Design a binder for this molecule. Structure first.
Ligand SMILES: [Mn+2]
Ligand SMILES: [Mn+2]
Length: 178
């Protein structure tokens, strides 16, 4: 699983994931499923930001915390948008909203509810992907064109396929907590 992560995700993604774990005192060589899941989430965030026209999205996820909030608070000042209680993943300059992205090993509906709740913000839009082609967005507004979504869903499906080929999928699949 460690090896699969290091083989399947760009080294920038792996470095950020390693860092995010060690900031919580977790060792990526031991909590290897969390390692994969962080990497997957970052990957989808980055894919998603490429999905628009360029300049459509600002990436917030993946930044150190000071930079992330610097971006967030700059956008709130510029655009007048309500400042979130916790860091989201992207800002959409076309729809003028923050977006919270989730990638679930469970079911999109439950994950969406947990997110809606974990953040509970009237403002932030939420878009959840599963590894089996499901997707659940705020007000069924899916933000990107269907081709862009399909590339994301295809990447997640390929990851899941590649893990199951190494017998990693069962354990990974079962590792997400409510
Ligand atoms: Mn985030
Ligand atoms: Mn997220």
């Amino acid at each position: 699983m460690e090896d699969f992560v290091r083989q399947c995700f760009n080294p920038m993604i792996v470095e950020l994931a390693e860092k995010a774990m060690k900031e919580y005192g977790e060792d990526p060589k031991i909590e290897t499923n969390k390692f994969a899941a962080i990497c997957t989430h970052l990957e989808v965030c980055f894919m998603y930001s490429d999905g628009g026209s360029k300049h459509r999205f600002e990436i917030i996820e993946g930044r150190d915390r000071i930079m992330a909030w610097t971006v967030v608070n700059s956008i709130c000042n510029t655009t007048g948008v309500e400042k979130p209680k916790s860091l989201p993943d992207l800002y959409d300059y076309k729809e003028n909203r923050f977006i919270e992205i989730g990638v679930t090993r469970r079911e999109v509906h439950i994950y969406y509810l947990e997110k809606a709740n974990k953040i509970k913000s009237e403002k932030t839009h939420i878009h959840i992907f599963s590894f089996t082609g499901e997707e659940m967005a705020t007000k069924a507004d899916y933000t990107l064109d269907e081709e862009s979504r399909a590339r994301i869903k295809t990447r997640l499906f390929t990851i899941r396929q590649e893990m199951a080929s190494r017998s990693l999928w069962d354990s990974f699949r079962q590792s997400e907590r409510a």
